[PDB]
Short mmCIF file of C-alpha atoms and ligand atoms in Angstrom, two decimals:
data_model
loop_
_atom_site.label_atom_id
_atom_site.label_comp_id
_atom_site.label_asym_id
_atom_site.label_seq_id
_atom_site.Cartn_x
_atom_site.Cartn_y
_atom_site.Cartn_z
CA UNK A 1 0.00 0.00 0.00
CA UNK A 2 1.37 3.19 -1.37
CA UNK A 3 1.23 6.30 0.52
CA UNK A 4 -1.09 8.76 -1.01
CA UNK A 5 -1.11 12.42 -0.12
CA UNK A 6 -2.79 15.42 0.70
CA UNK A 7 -0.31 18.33 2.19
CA UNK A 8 2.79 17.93 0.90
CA UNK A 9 2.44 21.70 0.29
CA UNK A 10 2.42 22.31 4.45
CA UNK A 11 4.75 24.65 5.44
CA UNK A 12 6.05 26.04 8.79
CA UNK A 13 5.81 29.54 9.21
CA UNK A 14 7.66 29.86 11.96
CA UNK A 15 10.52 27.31 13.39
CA UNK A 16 11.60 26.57 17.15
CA UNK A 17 14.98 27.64 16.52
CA UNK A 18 13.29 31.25 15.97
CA UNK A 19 10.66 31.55 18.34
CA UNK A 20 9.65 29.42 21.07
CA UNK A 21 8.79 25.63 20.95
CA UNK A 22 5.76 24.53 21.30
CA UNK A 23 4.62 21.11 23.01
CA UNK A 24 1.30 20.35 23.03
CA UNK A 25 -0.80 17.02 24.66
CA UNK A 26 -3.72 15.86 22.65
CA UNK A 27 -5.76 13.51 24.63
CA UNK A 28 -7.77 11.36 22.10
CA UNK A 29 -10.76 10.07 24.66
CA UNK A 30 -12.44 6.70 24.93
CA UNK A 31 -16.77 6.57 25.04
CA UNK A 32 -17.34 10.11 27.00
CA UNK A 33 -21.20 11.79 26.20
CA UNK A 34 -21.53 15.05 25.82
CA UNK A 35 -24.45 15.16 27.83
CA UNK A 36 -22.98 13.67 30.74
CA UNK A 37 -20.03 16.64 31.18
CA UNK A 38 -21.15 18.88 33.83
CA UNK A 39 -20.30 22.20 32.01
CA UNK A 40 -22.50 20.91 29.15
CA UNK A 41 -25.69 20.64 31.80
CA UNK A 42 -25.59 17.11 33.17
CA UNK A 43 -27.23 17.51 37.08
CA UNK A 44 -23.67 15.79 38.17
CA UNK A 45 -20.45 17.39 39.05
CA UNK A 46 -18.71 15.01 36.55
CA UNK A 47 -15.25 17.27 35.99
CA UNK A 48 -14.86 18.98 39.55
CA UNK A 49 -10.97 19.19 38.65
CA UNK A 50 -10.94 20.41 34.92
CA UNK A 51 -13.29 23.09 36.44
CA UNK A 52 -10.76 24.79 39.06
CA UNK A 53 -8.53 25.38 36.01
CA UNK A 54 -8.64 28.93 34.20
CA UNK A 55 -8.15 28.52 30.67
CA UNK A 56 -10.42 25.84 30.06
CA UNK A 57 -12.90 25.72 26.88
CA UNK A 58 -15.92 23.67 26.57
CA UNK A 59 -17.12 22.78 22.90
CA UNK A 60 -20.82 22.38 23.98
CA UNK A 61 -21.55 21.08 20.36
CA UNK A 62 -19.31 18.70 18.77
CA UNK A 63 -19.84 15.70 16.49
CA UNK A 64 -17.82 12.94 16.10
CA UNK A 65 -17.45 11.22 12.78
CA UNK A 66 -18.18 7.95 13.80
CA UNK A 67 -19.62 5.70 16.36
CA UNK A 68 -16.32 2.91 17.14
CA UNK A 69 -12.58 3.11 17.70
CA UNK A 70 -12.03 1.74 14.44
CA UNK A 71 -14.04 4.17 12.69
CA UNK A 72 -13.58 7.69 14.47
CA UNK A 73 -9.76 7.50 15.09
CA UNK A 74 -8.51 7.51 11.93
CA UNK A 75 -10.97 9.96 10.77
CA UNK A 76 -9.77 12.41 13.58
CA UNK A 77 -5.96 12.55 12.20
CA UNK A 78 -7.40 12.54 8.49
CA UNK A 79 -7.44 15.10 5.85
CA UNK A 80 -10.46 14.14 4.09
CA UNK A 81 -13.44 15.45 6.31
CA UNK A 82 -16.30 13.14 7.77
CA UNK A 83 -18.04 13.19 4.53
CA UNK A 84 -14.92 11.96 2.34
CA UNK A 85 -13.23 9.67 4.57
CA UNK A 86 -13.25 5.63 4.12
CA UNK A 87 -12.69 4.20 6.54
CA UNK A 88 -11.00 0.78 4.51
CA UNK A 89 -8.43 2.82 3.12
CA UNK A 90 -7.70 5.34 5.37
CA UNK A 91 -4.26 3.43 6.46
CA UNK A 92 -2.98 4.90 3.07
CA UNK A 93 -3.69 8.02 3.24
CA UNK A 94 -1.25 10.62 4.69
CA UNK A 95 -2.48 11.33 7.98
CA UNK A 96 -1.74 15.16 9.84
CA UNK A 97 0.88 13.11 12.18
CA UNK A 98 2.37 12.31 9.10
CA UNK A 99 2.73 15.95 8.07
CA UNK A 100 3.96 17.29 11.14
CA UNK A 101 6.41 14.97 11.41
CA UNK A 102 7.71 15.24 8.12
CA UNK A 103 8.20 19.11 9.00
CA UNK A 104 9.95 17.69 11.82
CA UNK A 105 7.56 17.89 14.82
CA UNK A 106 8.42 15.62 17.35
CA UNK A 107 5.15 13.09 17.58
CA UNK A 108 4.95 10.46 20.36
CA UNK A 109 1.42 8.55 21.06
CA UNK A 110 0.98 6.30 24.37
CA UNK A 111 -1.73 3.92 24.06
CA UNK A 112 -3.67 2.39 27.24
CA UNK A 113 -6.87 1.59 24.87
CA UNK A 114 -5.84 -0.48 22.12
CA UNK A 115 -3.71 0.87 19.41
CA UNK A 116 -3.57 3.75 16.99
CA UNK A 117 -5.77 2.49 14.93
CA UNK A 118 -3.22 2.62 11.63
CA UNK A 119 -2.46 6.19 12.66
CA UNK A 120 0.90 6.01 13.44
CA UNK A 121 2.18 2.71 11.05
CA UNK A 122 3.63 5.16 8.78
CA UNK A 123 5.74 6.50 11.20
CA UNK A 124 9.10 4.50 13.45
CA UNK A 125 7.19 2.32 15.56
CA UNK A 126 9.77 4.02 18.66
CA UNK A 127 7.07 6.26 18.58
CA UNK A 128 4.39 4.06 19.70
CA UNK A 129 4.18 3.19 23.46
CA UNK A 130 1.75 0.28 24.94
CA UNK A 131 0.83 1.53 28.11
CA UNK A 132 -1.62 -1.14 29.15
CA UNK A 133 1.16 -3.36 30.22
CA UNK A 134 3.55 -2.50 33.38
CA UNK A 135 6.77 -2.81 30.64
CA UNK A 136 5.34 1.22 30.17
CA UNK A 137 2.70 2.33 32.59
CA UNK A 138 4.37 2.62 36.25
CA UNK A 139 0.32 3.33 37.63
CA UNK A 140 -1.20 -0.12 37.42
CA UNK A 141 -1.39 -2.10 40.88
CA UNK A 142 -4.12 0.91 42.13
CA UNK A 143 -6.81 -1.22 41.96
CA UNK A 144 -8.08 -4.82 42.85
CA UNK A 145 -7.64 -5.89 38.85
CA UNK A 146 -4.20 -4.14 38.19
CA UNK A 147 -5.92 -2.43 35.43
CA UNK A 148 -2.86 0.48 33.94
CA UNK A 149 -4.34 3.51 34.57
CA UNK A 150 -4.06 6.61 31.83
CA UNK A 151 -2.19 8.76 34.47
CA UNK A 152 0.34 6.53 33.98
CA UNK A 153 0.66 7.58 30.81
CA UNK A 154 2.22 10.83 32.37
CA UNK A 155 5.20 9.39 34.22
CA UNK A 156 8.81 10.02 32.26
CA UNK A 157 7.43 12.55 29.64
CA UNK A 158 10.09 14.86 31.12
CA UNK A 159 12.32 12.61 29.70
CA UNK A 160 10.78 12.86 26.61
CA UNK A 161 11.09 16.60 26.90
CA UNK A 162 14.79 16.53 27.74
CA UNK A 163 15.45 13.92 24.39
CA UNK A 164 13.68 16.63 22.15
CA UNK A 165 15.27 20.05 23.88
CA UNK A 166 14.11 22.93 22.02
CA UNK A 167 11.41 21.04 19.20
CA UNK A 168 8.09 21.48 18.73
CA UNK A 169 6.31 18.08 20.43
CA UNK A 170 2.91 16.63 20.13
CA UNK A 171 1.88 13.97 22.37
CA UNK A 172 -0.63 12.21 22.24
CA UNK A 173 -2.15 10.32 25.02
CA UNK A 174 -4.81 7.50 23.85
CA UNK A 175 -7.49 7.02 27.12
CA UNK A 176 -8.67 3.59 28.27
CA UNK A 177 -11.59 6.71 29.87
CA UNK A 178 -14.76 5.46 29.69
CA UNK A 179 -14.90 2.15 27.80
CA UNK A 180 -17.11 0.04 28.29
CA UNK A 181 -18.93 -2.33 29.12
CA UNK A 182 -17.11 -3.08 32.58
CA UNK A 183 -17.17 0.53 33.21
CA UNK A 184 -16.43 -0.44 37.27
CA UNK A 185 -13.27 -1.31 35.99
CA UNK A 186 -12.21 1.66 34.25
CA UNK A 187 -11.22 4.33 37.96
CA UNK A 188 -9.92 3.40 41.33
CA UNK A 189 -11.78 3.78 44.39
CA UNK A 190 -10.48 7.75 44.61
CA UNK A 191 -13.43 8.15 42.42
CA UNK A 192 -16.50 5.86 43.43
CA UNK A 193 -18.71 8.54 44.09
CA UNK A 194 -21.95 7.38 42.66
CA UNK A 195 -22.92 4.54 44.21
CA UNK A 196 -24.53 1.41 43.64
CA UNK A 197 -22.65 0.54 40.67
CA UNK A 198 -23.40 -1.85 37.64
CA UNK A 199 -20.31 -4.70 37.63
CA UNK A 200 -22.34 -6.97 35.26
CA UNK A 201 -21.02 -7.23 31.52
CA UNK A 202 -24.59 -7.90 30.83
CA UNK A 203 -25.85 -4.09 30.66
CA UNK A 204 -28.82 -4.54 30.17
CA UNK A 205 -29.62 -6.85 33.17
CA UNK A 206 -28.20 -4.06 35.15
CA UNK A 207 -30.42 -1.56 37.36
CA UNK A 208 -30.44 1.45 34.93
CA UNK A 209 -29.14 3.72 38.02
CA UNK A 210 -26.08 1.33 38.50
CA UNK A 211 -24.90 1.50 35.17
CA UNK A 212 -25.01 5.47 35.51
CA UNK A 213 -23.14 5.28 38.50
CA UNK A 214 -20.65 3.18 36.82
CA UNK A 215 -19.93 5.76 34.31
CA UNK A 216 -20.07 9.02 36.08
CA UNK A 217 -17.28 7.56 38.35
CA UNK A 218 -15.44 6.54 35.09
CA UNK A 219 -15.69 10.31 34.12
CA UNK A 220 -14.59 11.46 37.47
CA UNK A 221 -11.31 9.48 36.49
CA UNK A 222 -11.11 11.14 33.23
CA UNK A 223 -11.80 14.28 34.80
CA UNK A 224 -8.43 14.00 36.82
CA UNK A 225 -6.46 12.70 33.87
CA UNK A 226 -7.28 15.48 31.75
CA UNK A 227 -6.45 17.81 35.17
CA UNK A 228 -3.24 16.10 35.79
CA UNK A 229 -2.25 16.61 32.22
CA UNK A 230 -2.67 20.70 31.65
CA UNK A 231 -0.72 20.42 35.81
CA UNK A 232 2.56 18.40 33.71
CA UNK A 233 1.81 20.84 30.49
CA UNK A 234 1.95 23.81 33.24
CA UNK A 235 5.69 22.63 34.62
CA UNK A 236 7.25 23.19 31.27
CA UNK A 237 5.03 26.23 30.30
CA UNK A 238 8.33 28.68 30.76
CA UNK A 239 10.63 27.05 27.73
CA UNK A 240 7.38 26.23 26.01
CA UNK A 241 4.20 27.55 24.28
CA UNK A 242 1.75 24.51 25.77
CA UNK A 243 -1.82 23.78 25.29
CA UNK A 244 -4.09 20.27 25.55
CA UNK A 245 -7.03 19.15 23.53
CA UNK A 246 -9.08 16.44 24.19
CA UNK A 247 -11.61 14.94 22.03
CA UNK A 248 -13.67 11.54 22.42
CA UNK A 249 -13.57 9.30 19.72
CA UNK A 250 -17.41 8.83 20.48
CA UNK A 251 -20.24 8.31 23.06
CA UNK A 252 -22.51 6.03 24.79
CA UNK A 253 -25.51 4.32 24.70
CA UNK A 254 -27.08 4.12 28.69
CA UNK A 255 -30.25 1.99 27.77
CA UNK A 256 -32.33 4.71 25.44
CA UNK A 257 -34.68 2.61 23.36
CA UNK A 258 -32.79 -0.32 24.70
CA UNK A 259 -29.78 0.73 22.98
CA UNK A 260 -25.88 -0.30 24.84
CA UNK A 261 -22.66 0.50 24.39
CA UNK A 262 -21.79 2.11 20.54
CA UNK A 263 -20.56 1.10 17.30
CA UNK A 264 -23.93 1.47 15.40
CA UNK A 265 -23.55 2.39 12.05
CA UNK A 266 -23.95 5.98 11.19
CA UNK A 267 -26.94 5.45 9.08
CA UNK A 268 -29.30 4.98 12.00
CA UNK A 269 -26.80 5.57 14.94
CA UNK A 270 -28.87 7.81 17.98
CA UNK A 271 -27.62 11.29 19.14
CA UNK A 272 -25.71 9.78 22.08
CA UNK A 273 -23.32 7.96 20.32
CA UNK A 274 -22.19 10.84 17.67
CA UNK A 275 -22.23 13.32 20.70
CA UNK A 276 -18.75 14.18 22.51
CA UNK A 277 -17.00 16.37 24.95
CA UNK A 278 -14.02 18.78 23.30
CA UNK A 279 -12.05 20.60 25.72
CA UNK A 280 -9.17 23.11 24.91
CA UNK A 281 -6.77 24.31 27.28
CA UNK A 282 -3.68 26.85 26.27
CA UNK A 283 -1.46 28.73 28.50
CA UNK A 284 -1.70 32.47 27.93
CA UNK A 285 1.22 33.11 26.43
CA UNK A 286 0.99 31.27 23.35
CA UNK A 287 -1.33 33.43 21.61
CA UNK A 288 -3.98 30.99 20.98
CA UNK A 289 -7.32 31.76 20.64
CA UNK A 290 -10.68 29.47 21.30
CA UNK A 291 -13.78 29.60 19.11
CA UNK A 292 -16.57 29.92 20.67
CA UNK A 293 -17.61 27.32 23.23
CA UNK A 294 -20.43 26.77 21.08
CA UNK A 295 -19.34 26.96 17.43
CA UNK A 296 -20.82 24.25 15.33
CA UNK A 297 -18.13 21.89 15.20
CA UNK A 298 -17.24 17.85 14.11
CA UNK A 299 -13.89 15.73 14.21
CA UNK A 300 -13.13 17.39 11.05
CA UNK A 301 -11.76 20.34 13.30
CA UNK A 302 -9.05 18.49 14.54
CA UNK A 303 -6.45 18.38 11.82
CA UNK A 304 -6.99 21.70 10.91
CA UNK A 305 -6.71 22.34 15.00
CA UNK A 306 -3.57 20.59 15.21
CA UNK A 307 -2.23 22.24 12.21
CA UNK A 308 -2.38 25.68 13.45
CA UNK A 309 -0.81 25.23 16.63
CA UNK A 310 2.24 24.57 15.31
CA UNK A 311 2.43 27.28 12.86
CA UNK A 312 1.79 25.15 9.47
CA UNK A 313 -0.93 25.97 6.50
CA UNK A 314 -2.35 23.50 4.14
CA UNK A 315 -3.86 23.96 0.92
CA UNK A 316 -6.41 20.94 1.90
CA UNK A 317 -7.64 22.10 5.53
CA UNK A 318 -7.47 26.32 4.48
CA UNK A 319 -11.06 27.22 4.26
CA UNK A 320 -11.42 24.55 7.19
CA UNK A 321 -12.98 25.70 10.80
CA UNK A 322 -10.73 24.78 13.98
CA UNK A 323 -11.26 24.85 17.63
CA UNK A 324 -8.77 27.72 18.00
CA UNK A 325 -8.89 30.62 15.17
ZN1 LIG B 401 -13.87 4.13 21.28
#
């Protein structure tokens, strides 16, 4: 399989040997609903840590381009927009980790979900990490099933930092978060604050307030990933122009009309599974600038998202709206 391409025309405007480097976290998130973030209207406190921290955008409106893993990731670090991409050949396609690292971005992804999804196979596979295993992730005997846990995912990216001194970085960080459907499994006790909880894999047998429970802890975990993230982005802010996105991949099904867990196809997929939390997060000094919390806005806004904050313009993504401007 050939590569085939889309922004071979991307150019850096501006290099970190002439201004300051820039090192940004993109958290690509794992089954979170919109409708259950707190800042969005849910009637629980589901992100009491992301709240405490100025800075913070919340994309009340966002639309994910598919319902699975399989599906939504690769369409999130595509060029071709929701409406163009397929997802059987999108392995091919040049991909805007591709681009970046081609201009010489450094790009590192650490996985506790499953893999990349084909984003990265283009790329040295150095710059994939498993972190569902204890070979990576140094967080993982927290809990009674010595499940890794995504803040582990944090440990040693100082070192990472000190290999690429004075580059532009993007790191991903690929959540475990909310999947499903043993979502008891997903936080430690820290964060069992709705209680009784669903521990059934058989949803729907499941009292419908359990399974709630369940995954309104799970977001309390995700809630103090995402926090603990901007607090690492925030030690190196001084050298460095940081921000974070996150983005679910998709949502939920909790039971409506029957319905569990996601992966229904697109065609006749319900509201809940399409609907997803964005949050952006930049340190003041970069010069970055949110849209709106509640622009209109899809997974299609991520390459072009990703694009700008490092400094580079494509011909493909131009006309294309971002979460920053
Ligand atoms: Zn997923």
């Amino acid at each position: 399989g050939s590569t085939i391409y889309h922004a071979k025309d991307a150019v850096q405007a501006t290099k970190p040997d002439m201004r300051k480097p820039r090192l940004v976290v993109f958290v690509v998130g794992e089954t979170a609903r919109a409708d259950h973030v707190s800042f969005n209207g849910y009637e629980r406190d589901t992100f009491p840590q992301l709240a405490k921290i100025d800075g913070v955008t919340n994309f009340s409106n966002v639309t994910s381009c598919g319902t699975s893993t399989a599906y939504s990731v690769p369409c999130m670090f595509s060029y071709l927009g929701a409406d163009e991409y397929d997802v059987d050949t999108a392995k091919y396609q040049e991909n805007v980790l591709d681009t970046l690292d081609r201009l010489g971005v450094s790009i590192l992804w650490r996985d506790n979900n499953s893999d990349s999804k084909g984003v990265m196979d283009k790329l040295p596979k150095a710059q994939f990490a498993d972190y569902k295993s204890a070979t990576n992730n140094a967080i993982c005997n927290t809990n009674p099933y010595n499940e890794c846990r995504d803040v582990g995912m944090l440990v040693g990216l100082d070192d990472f930092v000190a290999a690429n001194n004075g580059k532009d970085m993007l790191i991903m960080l690929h959540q475990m978060g909310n999947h499903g459907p043993a979502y008891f499994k997903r936080y430690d006790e820290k964060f069992a604050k709705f209680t009784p909880v669903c521990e059934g894999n058989e949803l729907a047998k499941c009292e419908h307030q359990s399974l709630i429970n369940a995954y309104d802890n799970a977001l309390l975990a995700t809630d103090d990933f995402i926090a603990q993230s901007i607090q690492w982005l925030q030690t190196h802010s001084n050298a460095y122009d940081v921000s974070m996105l996150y983005v679910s991949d998709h949502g939920e099904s909790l039971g409506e009309n029957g319905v569990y867990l996601h992966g229904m196809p697109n065609a006749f997929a319900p509201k809940e599974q399409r609907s997803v939390p964005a949050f952006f997060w930049t340190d003041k000094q970069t010069g970055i600038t949110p849209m709106a919390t509640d622009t209109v806005l899809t997974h299609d806004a991520i390459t072009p998202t990703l694009l700008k904050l490092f400094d580079v313009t494509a011909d493909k993504v131009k006309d294309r709206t971002a979460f920053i401007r």
